[PDB]
Structure formats: C-alpha cells, structure tokens
C-alpha cells in the first residue's frame, strides 16, 4: 500500500539497533511522521524478523494517547520501513540527561501515564518487556508515549542491558504482566535518583544485584516514593501490586498533575 517515493525524508531522529529513525513527510498530505528504517541483512544475521513482524502486529492494533501509533509498513531491496507517529519533544532518555534527575511532580505524572498505557496493553494480554527511558518518547504537550514494541509479546512467555529486567526474565523463568511493574519501579527510581537502582560496571554485577534485589535510596528520596518503589520492586512477581493500586497510591495521587 506504501512506497518510499511517497515520502520526503529529512533529519535523523535517533539510532536504533538495526537502522535509524528519520523525520519524514507524506508528499500528498504534507503529513509529518517518523520513518523507522531497518536493514534486512542486519535483522537476518540476528534472527529478529519474527519480533519485527510481532512489533508491527502488536503496535498497529493498539490505540491509546500514551502509546506511539504505527500507521503502516513497507520494504525496499534491503530496507524494512515502519511509518510511526512523530514524537516532537524527543525521549525521556534525553530529558533525564539535561535535568540530571526529575521532581516528584514530573515523575508521578510520567508514572501515571506509564501505568495508564500499561493497563490498556495488559487488558489485551500484551506485555511490553522493554520499558526504558530510551523507548519513552515525548509528544508536543509533553505527554509520555510508549514506543518500540520489538520485545512485546502475548502473556505468558519464556539480550541487551539488564537494568530494567525483572529477576524472573533474567533467569529464563516463565513471566506474565507483572514483568512490566518491575520496570515501572526501576523507572520511578531512575526518574528521582538519575540512575537505575541496579546499575553496575558489568553485566555480571547487574545480574547479581537484580537477582538479590540489592537497592539503597539516597537521602533526598521521600518516604511516599520509597514505599511505592519497594512495593513494585518485589522479587515475587505476585507480591507486586496491580497498576490500579499504583494509579491510586497516595504519593502518585498527591504528586501527579491530572488533565
Ligand atoms: N516516532 C518517533 N519520533 C521521534 N523519535 C523517534 C521515534 N521513533 C524512534 N525515535 C528515536 O529513534 C531511536 C530508535 O527508537 P526505537 O527504540 O524504535 O528503535 P530500536 O531501539 O532499534 O527498536 P527495537 O527495540 O525494536 O530495536 C530512539 O532513541 C528514539 O529517540
Ligand atoms: O524481503 C523480505 O522477504 C523481507 C520482508 C520483511 C517484512 C515485510 C513486511 C513487513 C515486515 Br514488519 C517485514 N522483513 C524481512 C526481514 F526482516 C529480513 C529479511 C527479509 C525480509
Ligand atoms: Mg529502542
């Protein structure tokens, strides 16, 4: 249905693993979108196709103001193209580099929009498994938008930086919707402290710290926050709350700026 000669390409937006994201314009409508270019050669030598076809299946069907739209796909000689909703205010990764750390207002607000989009995802039995500030894009009004559904899959189920992965996942063990709640705790901590609660210098140390759940809150972290992070960073996936509790938590309700 789509062809490259329908788009006026532009400036690069971010580098992926198997190709770059570029700013683009649909000639006939003047529509601004972001093109995610992937290379068949690269995806081949890794065996990601399935996941790339899964990413597209999952993302094309989901509709939420806190989830990035996938408007379609196409492919050339060696490139695979994904037509996405352009996020004009970049990523949460860049914003955290600038600000160093976020205030309770900003953090609660992001945690609220994150939980929101997650409920939707989980209600269709879809687990993201790759919730990272690198994959959390910002829309024109500063709204959070989950992106990159490469690692998403239908719940339950059996690579890169370990940080945002729950112990069940890093240990091959079977996993469900509760995986995304561990990520939610890791993100909250990182939003307030400026670093994830298990960061190390080696893949090796990170694994040990995650498996043991070895984390220590610095001075400036309030009780209200300390409580929710600890509530979400439980080794037992069933001992973790449901997004509903997260959304209604005193510290969230008190600090989140609603519409
Ligand atoms: N719609 C968009 N608008 C603005 N920037 C984007 C958009 N999509 C991606 N980017 C930028 O491009 C980079 C790549 O994003 P993405 O995570 O989709 O690629 P990826 O990590 O290779 O995906 P995958 O996890 O499937 O390999 C990100 O750092 C992001 O900042
Ligand atoms: O040329 C190919 O056979 C090829 C196609 C695709 C593809 C086609 C439509 C939608 C999507 Br999502 C992907 N992907 C490929 C790939 F990932 C590696 C090698 C070849 C292809
Ligand atoms: Mg990514």
Author numbering: 127 to 284, 290 to 390
Paper text:
Aurora A kinase (AURKA) is a member of a family of Ser/Thr kinases whose orthologues control progression through mitotic cell division. The localisation of AURKA to microtubules in the mitotic spindle is mediated through its interaction with a protein partner, TPX227. Besides localisation, the AURKA-TPX2 interaction modulates the catalytic activity of AURKA3738. Here, we report the identification of AurkinA, a drug-like inhibitor of AURKA, which binds to a pocket occupied by Y8 and Y10 of TPX2 in the AURKA-TPX2 complex (the Y-pocket).
To provide structural insight into how AurkinA binding might hinder formation of the AURKA-TPX2 complex, we determined the crystal structures of the AURKA catalytic domain in isolation or when liganded to AurkinA. We noted that whilst the structure for AA30, like that for AurkinA could be determined in complex with AURKA bound either to Mg2+-ATP or JNJ-7706621 in the active site, the AA29 compound could only be soaked into AURKA complexed with JNJ-7706621. Interestingly, depending on the concentration of reducing agent in buffer, the AURKA kinase domain crystallised either in space group P6122 or in P41212. In contrast, the binding of AurkinA, and indeed any of our compounds increased the overall B-factors of the crystal structures. Importantly, in all structures where a small molecule is bound in the Y-pocket, the electron density for the AURKA activation loop remained largely undefined. More detailed analysis of the liganded crystal structures revealed that binding of AurkinA and its analogues caused significant local alterations to AURKA structure, as well as changes at sites distant from the Y-pocket. Based on our structural data, we hypothesised that the allosteric, Y-pocket-binding inhibitors would not affect the Km for ATP, as no significant changes in residues involved in ATP binding directly were observed upon AurkinA binding and ATP was always present in the active site. The F165-F144 backbone hydrogen bond was significantly shortened (3.2 Å to 2.8 Å) and the K143-Q168 hydrogen bond present in the ‘active’ apo structure was broken in the presence of the Y-pocket binders, potentially impairing the ADP removal from the ATP-site.
